[PDB]
Write a protein that binds this ligand. Sequence first.
Ligand SMILES: O=C(O)C1=C[C@@H](OP(=O)(O)O)[C@@H](O)[C@H](O)C1
Length: 426
Amino acid sequence: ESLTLQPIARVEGTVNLPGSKSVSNRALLLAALARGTTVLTNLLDSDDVRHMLNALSALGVQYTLSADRTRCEVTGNGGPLRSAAALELFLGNAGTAMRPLAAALCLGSNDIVLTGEPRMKERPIGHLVDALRQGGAQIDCLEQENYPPLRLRGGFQGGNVEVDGSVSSQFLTALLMTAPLAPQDTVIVIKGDLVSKPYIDITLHLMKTFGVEVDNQSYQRFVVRGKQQYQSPGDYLVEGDASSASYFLAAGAIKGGTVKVTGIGRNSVQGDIRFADVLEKMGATVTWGDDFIACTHGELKAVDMDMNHIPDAAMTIATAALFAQGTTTLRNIYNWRVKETDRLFAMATELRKVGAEVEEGEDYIRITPPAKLKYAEIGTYNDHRMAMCFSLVALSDTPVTILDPKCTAKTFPDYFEQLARISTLA
Ligand SMILES: O=C(O)C1=C[C@@H](OP(=O)(O)O)[C@@H](O)[C@H](O)C1
């Protein structure tokens, strides 16, 4: 399968964002653990969320979904997830299911195997397993240490644990969400640098919404009290997805017009709202509201920036760089290599097909645009963001052909239709 995008002369309009994947999967897990019934509004319907929903169903969590799957009423367990069956749960390539559920299922005495698609068995989890085992969990890495599939037999108590922060923030997120329900207090010491810190902030905001606070000591040590129970907030509104928003804001920066996205704004908890600051630095004009961000085209110039705070939205800058004057350098993005694909390799390989000169560093990428873009078929590596980032090539005089376009469904099934709604073809 492929989709050819014809050259787009102008983008403009207003995009009502689908729900945030990061918020959706945290809120589903917390609602399943909490006391009380939580009603989630603007939940994302995408593969990653569906895998979380299916796992929760298999684990006995009671919930109802609206016809469109964006409103979900979750009856909380008022305690850890529990199954008497020796289940095997398939989690696709959803890190926000695999990492958080691996930790959550270490509470109690279940016997559950977590697995996923071939790529998920190549994505690291050892830093999380190490910390969980330090706290008493029984875990078997059935194929190789440091990777799924995992057999979880429970027993996490708490105590003094160390988690490496240098590869994924999702390990710390998973520990943070599970620790409050453990029988003992947990003191988490961070080994090394912590990457993707804004996603830790999402986790802490969500936990607070569900009635639990922790002591965050400068992102280097976290004190969590055990013996707690999450408390349903009642209604909870899932923010629009700020990572999905990046494509439309960038499209406005490149080929607007003014493109406005709704469902996020200046006070959102998602770190990817800071992507708009990059577009502003490149020369676009950005306007903020409480519930929108808008971007209007201006002449674009390259940037050289540390992108560790926005690793996903940073991919959008890599293709937006094709439209900027000068060489763009994106630094401190090593963990691109361990995500849906090796995104440093993939981004460099596909950018070169459209004519860019690319230096693929170990943990950075440097992109020098060609004078004129070239037509290419873009491989997408079963990575939603490769498809969505390369859609921006068509904001030029050159079409682009996206291979396997349905991979966008990991987080954004209707991406191309939403892009078409704001596009005027040349
Ligand atoms: O916690 C989250 O919701 C996420 C954390 C990030 O991963 P890393 O912490 O591995 O960078 C991000 O890339 C991912 O898409 C979503």
